[PDB]
């Protein structure tokens, strides 16, 4: 009875499929499921990601465990990923990493949940 | 070592009151918090965060949501009767032009074009 059920997928336009495959599948450890001539699909963090090749007003955040924070931070740096600054102590307190994919779509890894944010936090409903 | 799940999606929006009505009332999401400048929703099991930026000027991304196939007509009519920008499947935008879709089957089903390479 009358609800959107779940996320079906997200889709990004990208300049170079092979570069984006390396990013989403090798660096971020997603699974490549299918390709076409100008198309690739992945499963990542339980989500389906579609890339369509086409040669700051949105971001997508994935959850990671606290205990994997330094693993991720270093994997992104070792792979020369473009890392962006977050809030003061986001790195030292293992809260968030912000970064872009090869085309500049903004991504984040976060160790908290929505309730954590709500509790840490204005008008509450 | 795996990313465990999606955490949330953040959208810039020109007018927070319009976006709240779009997300909470048209799409039937749950409003959790406001401040600012900001609103948080739970919609389709996903945290959505809106940040109001009143001087915004949208083609290179979309988020798609799954609906009951028996509800296709319900949703299609709901969006039409609410003057939503509309472009099996419904393709539409929010008040700021963020690209959204509704589909009545999972991307995995859909994928199940001989020339494509399946892994």
DSSP string, B78-94: HHHHTT--B--EEEEE-
Check if B91 contacts A (Cβ < 8 Å): no
Does B7 contact A113 at a Cβ distance shorter than 8 Å? yes
Rounded Cα distance between B92 and A89, Å, is 39
Structure tokens at B19: 């976006």
- Which of A94, A3, A8, A11 has its CA nearest to residue A49? A11
Backbone Cα Rg of chain A:
16
Domain-by-domain residue ranges, chain B? 1-116
CB contact at 8 A, A41 and B111: yes
Cβ within 8 Å of residue A13, ≥6 positions away: A51, A52, A53, A54, A103, B59, B60, B61
Tell whether B37 lies on the interface with A, counting CB pairs under 8 A: no
Nearest Cα residue to A29 out of A12, A39, A44: A44
Burial of B98 (0-12, 13-18, 19+ CB in 10 A): buried
**Total length of chain B:** 119
Is A47:B66 a contact under the CB 8 Å cutoff? no
Nearest by Cα to B8 from A47, A86, A4, A90: A47
Q: What is the CA A88 to chain-centroid distance, rounded? A: 20
Do the annotations mark residue B42 as ligand-binding? Answer: no
Binding-site residues of A for Mg(2+), in ranges, read 9, 59, 108
Q: How far apart are CA B66 and CA A63, in angstroms?
A: 21
Beta bridge partners of B64: A9, B101
| B1-116 CATH, one of 3.30.930.10, 3.90.1150.10, 3.40.50.2300, 3.10.180.10 | 3.10.180.10
Pick the CATH number of A1-122 from 3.20.20.220, 3.10.180.10, 3.40.30.120, 3.50.50.60: 3.10.180.10
Specify whether the CB–CB gap between A70 and B1 falls below 8 A.
Answer: no
Cα–Cα distance, A43 to A16 (Å, whole number): 19
Specify the resolution in Å: 1.9
Question: Using the beta-carbon criterion (under 8 Å), do A123 and B34 form an inter-chain contact?
Answer: yes
Nearest CA to B29 out of B44, B18, B12 is that of B44
Residues flagged as binding site of A: 9, 59, 108
Would you tell me which residues 42-71 of chain B have a C-beta closer than 8 angstroms to some C-beta of chain A? 42-47, 53, 56, 58-68, 71
Query: What gap in Å lies between CA B11 and CA B41, rounded to an integer?
Result: 11
């Amino acid at each position: 009875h009358h609800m959107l059920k779940s996320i079906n997928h997200i889709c990004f336009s990208v300049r170079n499929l092979n570069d984006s495959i390396h990013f989403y599948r090798d660096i971020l450890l997603g699974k490549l499921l299918l390709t076409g001539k100008k198309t690739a699909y992945f499963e990542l963090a339980g989500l389906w990601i579609a890339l369509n090749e086409e040669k700051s007003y949105t971001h997508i955040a994935f959850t990671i465990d606290d205990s994997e924070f330094k693993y991720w931070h270093q994997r992104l740096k070792d792979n020369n990923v473009n890392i962006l600054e977050g809030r003061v102590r986001d790195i030292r307190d293992r809260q968030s990493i912000y970064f872009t994919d090869p085309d500049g779509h903004k991504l984040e890894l976060h160790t908290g949940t929505l309730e954590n944010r709500l509790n840490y936090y204005m008008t509450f409903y």
